[PDB]
Every structure is written in structure tokens, then in C-alpha cells.
With several copies, the nearest count.
Chain A
Amino acid sequence: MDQAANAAESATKDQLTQEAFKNPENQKVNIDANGNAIPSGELKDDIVEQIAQQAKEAGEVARQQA
């Protein structure tokens, strides 16, 4: 009824999120005290944005069909 509005969305987000990290480009980086780079799970905003879009849009075709 109103669960696909998450299932379709949620399955999509994660999947797109998983494929994002397989590419360093999309990721962000931090600086340890020594001033050296370090990995920080977070992805670039225009990427998080771009995923959390095609997502709620996929979770939309969910409810509309229920």
C-alpha cells in the first residue's frame, strides 16, 4: 500500500550508492592531524543528490502502481 514507496526507492538508493564507492572520484576525503589525506565514507553532494533523486522517483513509480 505505502511500503513500495520505500522498497523501490530504498533498494535503488543503496544499489546506486554501492556502485558509487567503486570509484574514488565520487568520494570525499579528510585530513588527519599530520595533514595527510584519509577516506571518509561520505560521497560528494552532487552524487548523494543525484542518487537520492532517481530514488524517491523510483519509489514513486511504486505507490502509483499500488
Chain B
Amino acid sequence: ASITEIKADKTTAVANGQDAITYTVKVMKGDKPVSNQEVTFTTTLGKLSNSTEKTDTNGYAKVTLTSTTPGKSLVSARVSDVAVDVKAPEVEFFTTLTIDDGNIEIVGTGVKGKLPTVWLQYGQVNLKASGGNGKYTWRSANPAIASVDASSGQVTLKEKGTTTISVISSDNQTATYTIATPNSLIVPNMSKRVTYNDAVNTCKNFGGKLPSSQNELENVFKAWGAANKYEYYKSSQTIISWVQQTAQDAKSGVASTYDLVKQNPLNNIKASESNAYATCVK
């Protein structure tokens, strides 16, 4: 007539009503293990599989616990025919951990939403985790395409491609967000000022076309805002960029330009003089 062992298979679990913690008690009478001794359990949080159980021939009696709400569940077993009980070790339940793919904040602007399909290479967003126990550490499955700050979940987009970032909580849960390959990756060759020719010369070269209309570039801005807010461009007060040369622009020997910082859309610019920058798309 005595509980001498009260163990718990684990001390953390998801408050999803399914992740279960198993409690095992052992009832003895000296060296002799007692069997068919009924034991009663009670928790202060969650659902017990049963509230009474009979020990097997080795004096063991298991029971399970689950919870739909987070918190600390303090279980306690007791030998039916006896007065005093025994408290099991404290355990904790945490809500399912997740990375909200909807609340992705764009560092520059501050706007939150799905991850843009148009990346201003070296741009940055903040991934937001929900659940677990609060503490998070992040990781990217390929720092080349996209990297993430270990402890802040700040992601910076790099190469046009697809990878998945994951987050792990201290209560040992895991969540993952997939970064789908973007439709187009905006890359401003910041080397030096340049001309419309050396420009197309630039895109075609490393690969990719020159941006279409001003709109195509204007859009980038309406997604990331002044590109100088992002580390990598924290110094360039201006990113006036070459746009395509319309049928007439050609003749007039001029082009149009959109600024990824000042916006300041302009026209009839010297197509020959080193007036703008080589910003290539895709």
C-alpha cells in the first residue's frame, strides 16, 4: 500500500487536445510489487484518460493527459484505500507553434502581408512566430536564396529561388514557412553612373532585361519603399534608374527614369550621358 515511483514520459506538450503526456506510477509493499491495486489520478489542467487505474502484476499503472488550453498541469496520483497522495512532476502545455505567413512585415514600409512576388534584392522582411513558449530561434534551408537572423526572424532576400525558413521554440516545437521563388528579382547594379547603352549592355550581360516602363519600377517602390532603408543600400541617397526607351525616345535620343529612393519619375533624359543607374530585373 504505497506509491514509490511517479514518472512522466515528458514535460512539454502541445495544447492541441491530442499531444499526450504519460504518467507512470509504481505501487509497492516493501520489495513485493502490488497488483490490481487501484490508483486514482487528478490533474489541475487538462483531461486524464481515466481517473482510476489498476496496477499490472509489476505494480505499474499508466495514465495519460492532454489539454486544449496551455498552462501548467499539476497531476497527482493516490492509492484508492489510502488518504495521502503523491504529486507528479509539474508539466507544461503550449499552443501549436506557427510562422504567420500573413503577417510578414516589410522593414522599409512597415506594411504586413503575404511575401512580395517582386523582390528588391537585399530587401528585408520580418517573419512573425505565434505560439510555443515565446522564445524563438530561426533558420533558413539555404542562406544563399534567403537568409534569416537567428534570433529575430528578420529575413533578407538574396537569390531568385525557393527555400523554406523554419523556427523552433524552446518548448521544442517546430514551424516552417516556404519562400516561393519570386516572379522577378530587382537588382540595381550600384557600381557607377552609366548610360542607356552601357545599361542594356549591363542587364543583357550578367543576364536579364532592363526594366520595362516606369510602372514596373514604381511598383517595386510600392512594396519596399525607399530602397535605402535596407542595410545594403543604407548609403545611396539616390537610385535614379534607366527605364526602357519607347519608340520615340529612341529617335529623341532620350529615356525615362524612376528612382528607387526618391521615386522622382523623370523624362527626356540624355540617353548618352552617364545619367542613371543599371538596375536589372529577373
Q: A residues bordering B, Cβ < 8 Å?
A: 25, 27-31, 34-37, 40, 42, 44-47
Contact = CB atoms under 8 A, between A and B. Distances in A.
B251 A28 contact: no
Contact of A30 (B238, B252, B269): B269
A32 to B, nearest CB: 10
A30 B262 contact: no
30 contacts: A28-B254, A28-B269, A28-B270, A29-B254, A29-B266, A29-B267, A29-B269, A30-B270, A30-B275, A31-B193, A31-B257, A31-B269, A34-B237, A34-B238, A35-B239, A35-B240, A35-B259, A35-B261, A35-B262, A36-B264, A40-B270, A44-B252, A44-B253, A44-B254, A45-B251, A46-B248, A46-B251, A46-B252, A46-B253, A47-B252
A31 B258 CA distance: 12
Interface of B: 193, 237-240, 248, 251-254, 257, 259, 261-262, 264, 266-270, 273, 275-276
Contacts, number: 54
A45 B252 contact: yes
A10 to B, nearest CB: 23
Contacts of B264: 35-36
B206 to A, nearest CB: 23
Contacts of B269: 28-31, 37
Contact of A27 (B239, B251, B257, B268): B268
B264 to A, nearest CB: 7
Contacts of A35: 237-240, 259, 261-262, 264
In the complex, which of the residues A25, A29, A34, A47 has the most CB atoms of chain B within 10 Å of its own CB atom?
A29
Contacts of B252: 28, 44-47
Contacts of A44: 251-254, 268
A41 B261 CA distance: 27
Contacts of B257: 31
B270 A29 contact: yes
